[PDB]
Structure 1
């Protein structure tokens, strides 16, 4: 059976995937870099994956309004606003924000992964995490094309180096 702590996790990650989807849709509409469109689609997939677990356990969905920018947990509302403002400044700032979101997601997925023994919850979280590593590699390579790079904020320097020095999974 699912624990209250495990429920709290799925609730947070349901909106964390939405944060990434929403920022990326917003930055695509701004800068029309295909990367944002492509990855926003992948985030929609991830949102769906978490929703399927929510439904499986009949947990109330925090997403009561699918509209871009709308969140139940204000942690994500504040992150949405701060990150779109940053990302509006330049193509490089928007790509840095992509890398930032993925950085936070990988750190948060690690957090929740380490609090559960449920194999169906782990498979989804591991798959989400593999996705976020792929996204991080894609955003950084793009920052490289602009003559830029990324400094990690949430995961360790060492984890960041392992991600970017390997090819996409």
Structure 2
């Protein structure tokens, strides 16, 4: 029941991964003004706060030294932020696909970390986060459907992607 360095590394990654979702969705909201990005950004702020509560619980240094949109300590996220906002700027459909894409990445990463921890505190937050992301994914894809488009998964398997989109809400 003490936390391991590995479990700390997971929380540090997820704290900024939820920020990546929040910041890309804010940025795309300011561009396209589709309410889904505003709504889900707020949910990502909730998710960020959930990770932060665990960071504080274990007195782990918060990787978010600057809450400004686009700012990250781990450059994998700074890179993804730049990549994804450039793709999302092209059209409403490209922005919705970027939404699905971030949810796809986040679900895959949440599974990765869930599987490395036996910690009831941590597992619980991750499960809740994953339930959230599956709902975000369903929301983005349904919106892509309204535009006569769809989504091809990149990080999660085809099979898990189909199980997410063929079900209702959690």
TM-score (norm 1): 1.00
- Deviation string, structure 1 residues 61-111 (Cα, Å, up to 9, x no partner): 000000000000000000000000000000000000000000000000000
Structure 2 residue aligned with 1:65: 66
The Cα of 1:130 is off from its aligned counterpart by 0.2
CA RMSD of aligned residues (A): 0.2
SS of structure 1 residue aligned to 2:59:
coil
The Cα of 1:18 is off from its aligned counterpart by 0.0
The Cα of 1:24 is off from its aligned counterpart by 0.1
Instruction: Work out the CA distance in 2 between the residues paired with 1:168 and 1:101.
Output: 19
Q: Count how many residue pairs are aligned between Structure 1 and Structure 2.
A: 169
Instruction: Work out the CA distance in 1 between the residues paired with 2:107 and 2:169.
Output: 15
SS of structure 1 residue aligned to 2:124:
helix
Alignment of 1:146-157 (within 5 A): 146-157=147-158
Instruction: Work out the CA distance in 2 between the residues paired with 1:68 and 1:152.
Output: 26
Structure 2 residue ranges without an equivalent (≥5): none
The Cα of 1:42 is off from its aligned counterpart by 0.1
| 4+ aligned runs moved over 2 Å, structure 1 | none
Instruction: Work out the CA distance in 1 between the residues paired with 2:63 and 2:17.
Output: 11
Structure 2 residue aligned with 1:79: 80
The Cα of 1:168 is off from its aligned counterpart by 1.4
Instruction: Work out the CA distance in 2 between the residues paired with 1:83 and 1:13.
Output: 18
Instruction: Work out the CA distance in 2 between the residues paired with 1:91 and 1:168.
Output: 24
Structure 1 residue ranges without an equivalent (≥5): none
The Cα of 1:141 is off from its aligned counterpart by 0.1
SS of structure 2 residue aligned to 1:116:
coil
The Cα of 1:151 is off from its aligned counterpart by 0.1
- Deviation string, structure 1 residues 109-142 (Cα, Å, up to 9, x no partner): 0000000000010000000000000000000000
TM-score (norm 2): 0.99
Structure 2 residue aligned with 1:3: 4
